[PDB]
């Protein structure tokens, strides 16, 4: 379809018309939108042992620690011993086997979130245990592995897998547990959040989330992180760069220039944008080219492309919701709490109108340019065309 731009208007006395439905329905319960319950995961913490018995005959320790995980999930243990018991498995496991391995770890880390959100875990204990360097890379690999396990499969067929952003991941309703790990740590230690984001993005590249044929010149190396930390603690090092730093500036400006072009290939531009945007988000003022940005509108182009990724992610979430009524991902929704096939009356009054305003919101403050049009306008048009030919069916 050549569906024209969804021109709408989101004002007062219309915000709560759909958000009130979003305030109590199954989706959007643990999310947010741009315009701005223990039983659900308890049942999965019980069903963790569905198919494990089937292929025991090699696999026995999987069932053995599945039993231990279920035991720790329901039992109440004082915080100074619960963390040690649960790290017994976190600090022993190394590696059809591996799918079950991460599920043990993924559900293990949610226990800390479950007890911390229940005020069972003191904030000081969490702050003392998050300084451990091992768990930062551990969680960095677990997040990306679990995501590429389930949402990558649905995004690839959706055509939106090309616009997956590393930093823009906490918004997922399943991954509603990372808000605490991010906020508490960053308002307690800013450097460590940037460190873990850097590790996570490096793991994302090495694991094929943003593949390339060229080596990572900013990630997977200790020299880089040492230099970035030194810059973050020295506000006047860009003025007089030293050794190993001229090359970083050269490479970053090559990346920025390559992004700024229009007729070169798209995949490398998206990859460079991913790495660079992560770079500023975790390290402010690294690319303060106050002369080129003024003549290039680059700074605003950052918000344009980031909001494009945001709206495309939300569109993918809406698609995975509407087709469900398992694309929600493995170990995401149990069989009993599943959503059947029959259509529900509240969707006709809160879905077409909601996606109508969503597109209008992103198409109300985005600049239009030949470089941006192939990065923002064309994906928006293709998403609109695909999303306006599947709602009635």
């Amino acid at each position: 379809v050549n569906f024209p731009f969804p021109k709408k208007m989101i004002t007062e006395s219309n915000s709560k018309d759909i958000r009130e439905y979003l305030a109590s329905t199954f989706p959007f319960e643990q999310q947010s939108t741009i315009l701005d319950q223990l039983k659900f995961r308890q049942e999965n913490l019980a069903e963790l042992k569905d198919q494990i018995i089937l292929s025991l005959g090699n696999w026995q320790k999987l069932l053995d620690y599945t039993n231990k995980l279920d035991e720790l999930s329901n039992t109440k243990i004082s915080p100074e011993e619960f963390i040690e018991e649960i790290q017994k498995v976190l600090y022993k496991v190394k590696l059809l086997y591996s799918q079950f391995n991460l599920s043990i770890q993924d559900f293990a880390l949610q226990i800390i979130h479950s007890k911390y959100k229940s005020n069972q875990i003191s904030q000081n204990d969490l702050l003392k245990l998050i300084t451990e360097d091992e768990m930062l890379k551990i969680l960095a690999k677990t997040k990306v592995l679990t995501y590429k396990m389930k949402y990558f499969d649905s995004a690839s067929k959706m055509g939106i897998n090309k616009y997956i952003s590393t930093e823009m991941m906490d918004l997922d309703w399943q991954f509603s547990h990372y808000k605490t790990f991010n906020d508490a740590l960053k308002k307690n230690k800013a450097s460590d959040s940037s460190y873990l984001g850097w590790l996570t993005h490096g793991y994302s590249i090495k694991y094929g989330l943003s593949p390339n044929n060229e080596r990572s010149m900013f990630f997977q190396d200790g020299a880089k992180y040492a230099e970035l930390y030194a810059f973050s603690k020295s506000p006047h090092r860009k003025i007089i760069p030293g050794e190993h730093l001229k090359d970083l500036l050269a490479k970053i400006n090559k990346s920025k220039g390559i992004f700024l072009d229009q007729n070169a290939l798209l995949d490398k531009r998206i990859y460079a944008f991913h790495e660079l945007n992560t770079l500023e988000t975790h390290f402010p003022g690294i690319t303060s080219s106050f002369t080129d940005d003024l003549k290039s509108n680059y700074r605003k182009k950052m918000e344009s492309v980031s909001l494009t990724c945001q709206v495309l992610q939300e569109i993918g979430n809406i698609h995975r919701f509407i087709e469900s009524k398992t694309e929600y991902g493995l170990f995401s929704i149990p069989k009993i709490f599943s959503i059947p096939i029959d259509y529900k009356h509240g969707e006709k009054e809160n879905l077409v109108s909601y996606v109508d305003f969503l597109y209008s919101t992103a198409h109300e403050r985005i600049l239009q340019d030949n470089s941006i049009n192939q990065l923002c306008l064309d994906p928006l048009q293709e998403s609109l065309n695909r999303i306006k030919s599947n709602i009635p069916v």
């Binding site: 080596r215 200790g222 020299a223 040492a226 930390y229 030194a230 603690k233 006047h236 050794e243 001229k246």
Partner: protein, 827 residues
Amino acid sequence: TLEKKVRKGIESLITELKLMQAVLSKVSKVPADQLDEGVKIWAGNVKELSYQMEDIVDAFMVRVKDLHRISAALEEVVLQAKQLAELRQRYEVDPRMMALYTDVTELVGIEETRDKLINMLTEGDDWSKHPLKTISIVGFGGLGKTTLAKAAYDKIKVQFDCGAFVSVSRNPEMKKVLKDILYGLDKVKYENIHNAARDEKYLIDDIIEFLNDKRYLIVIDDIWNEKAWELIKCAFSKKSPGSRLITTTRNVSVSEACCSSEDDIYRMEPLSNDVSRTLFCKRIFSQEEGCPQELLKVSEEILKKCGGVPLAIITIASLLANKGHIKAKDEWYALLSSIGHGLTKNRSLEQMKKILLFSYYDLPSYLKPCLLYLSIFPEDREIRRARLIWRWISEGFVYSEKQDISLYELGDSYFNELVNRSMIQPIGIDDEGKVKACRVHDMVLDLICSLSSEENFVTILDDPRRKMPNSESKVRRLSIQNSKIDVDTTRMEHMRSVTVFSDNVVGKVLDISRFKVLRVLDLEGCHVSDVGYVGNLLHLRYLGLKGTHVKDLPMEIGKLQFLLTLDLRGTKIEVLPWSVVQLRRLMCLYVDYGMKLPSGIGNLTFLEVLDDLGLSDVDLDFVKELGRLTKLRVLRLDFHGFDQSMGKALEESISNMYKLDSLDVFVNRGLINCLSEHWVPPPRLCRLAFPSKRSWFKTLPSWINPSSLPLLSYLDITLFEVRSEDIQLLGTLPALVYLEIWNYSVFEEAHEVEAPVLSSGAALFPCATECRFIGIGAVPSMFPQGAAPRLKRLWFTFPAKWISSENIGLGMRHLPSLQRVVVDVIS
């Protein structure tokens, strides 16, 4: 049997090699202007025979079937040398003098520079009671050194009693120079002085007795080979206040032999962009520049080439406009293409090429090839000096017999000797503490390329050039460049070396295994990973594969018994083959920390520099094994998984090493449980870096003391706490040119920036140009300006509650150029 005759002929070949190299060095001294063409042709043929017999003897050395081949080749080359013998028997003023006579109102931008030279010497002429001083002017090739001296000279002559210009050539005659000095002082009493023939000494005595009770201002220029100037300085050895001297030279190692003071040395720089443009438009253009508006970009790009050298621009402008701009926008581009490879083959331009070749001829031997080697690399790019050093060593350009030198420091000395001869610009500082890379002037680079191509020294394939030699067989050095079209490689069998510059044509058109003999292989920047044929190459020395997408390398690397370099940065390989201990000779191993080294590294006894050794999942024997091989000079270490008493074991095993010059250890966010406080460091050490910032020491290391390791010039240290006595202890150290300290607890805990003080001593910092303090308050009211005489930048932290305090005593101009600083302030 058969081996004895060849084993006997080899050293006869070697004796002939020595004799030929001697005569070749002798014949290459003369400029190619007084040398007859017959001797030159014979010399070229001799040079070709020199290469052939070197190749034969090297083949013998590496190989020892083949003996028959060696014997046949040896007899053949003997017949060739014989036959070349009888052919030879059978058939048998200063260019810059004119410049000195140039119209004064023809020099643009001179007066301000002249004033700077005048008031740096006459400021003491006010109260002309000061002891005499000399002002030395340095530079490269020709950029105003003699003229500037004359402008100053012709200005201040009323306020003296004597004075004269005297020139000294490449090879002076001391009596002539002294007679010139005598003649210029007085032309009446010494009118016929050039006829008097006493000696070098009585006329020195006469010149001394003449200059008693007089202020003169004698100026001597073009002094080369400092040993010559030690004679003149004896003429100037009596006290004479208010008198002064000027010296001009292209050697910056002779200027410190004058005036004994670095503030008197006058480094002088090329003209600025606009001044050079004004000069350029003064010659060609009559009075206006707004007419062309179409070749303005061409003039920009031309002036960029010459850079700032008043000479180059004067010559090019004279060439460009004989009478009213006889050329426009077509042959301007033809000239631009011609420069870089073939511009000098023209008329009225050969005048300056002698002025540039002066320095090349003054070079000793064993340095002409080193300078000529620079013609390989492209027009405008920084050249890492380590690459040059290793390539020189592998080529055979560096050699000695002293056995007290590791043959690498020798190459570094050669590079520094090139630098101080004012021929290559050094720029930047590397991670080892020395010059990072070098750059050569565009005119000089193109001029030397032609000189190298006059023989078969190198061969370059360039699209602007697009030219080939007539004899494909006699090719030794190749430099593939942007050209990717005519890549014939059939008749180059004895190829000494090959390198490729940023080309994707490599591999798919190139066939390197066909080069049966090959000495170095350089593959910077290529995107080819098909290395499976280097086992066939057995003469290889240098193998560079930085950034080459090499995923894996053949198992039979061990066969390359001769080898000196492996650079493996930026490669995709993550594990070295076990067949690397089999290597017997090596001096450098450039590896990244990701790769895993096989056991047995202790057998690489000759290893000279190691870079980025990764220590992850390492056992005790491997850690101890590095200590048996003690020849390292640079070592870089990082690790993630052995932080135990193995750390102390390695820390003790390092002390076995007695030749380190640099060290650096990288570790993430941890206390350094590696260095023990009861441990002797190596006697020699300069760098001792610690680039990690998340890491820290609990206390200042005890072994850091002015007594031991007295040669340090770099720290990059970081500690958890800080003390007011640690800074004082650091002030006891002799050199410590570079300073940097980080206060970990300040940036990690709630700690207040305290104000440490140096209580003991007076200065404690004789020479520390750079000083950096992060999380540590270095208030500049710590001592009067007579503490750190040379300190260009200083960093510290200033809390805002100290604004009202009285300990902030800045505002006075310290001795060094310390008026530019932006201190990081905290509320």
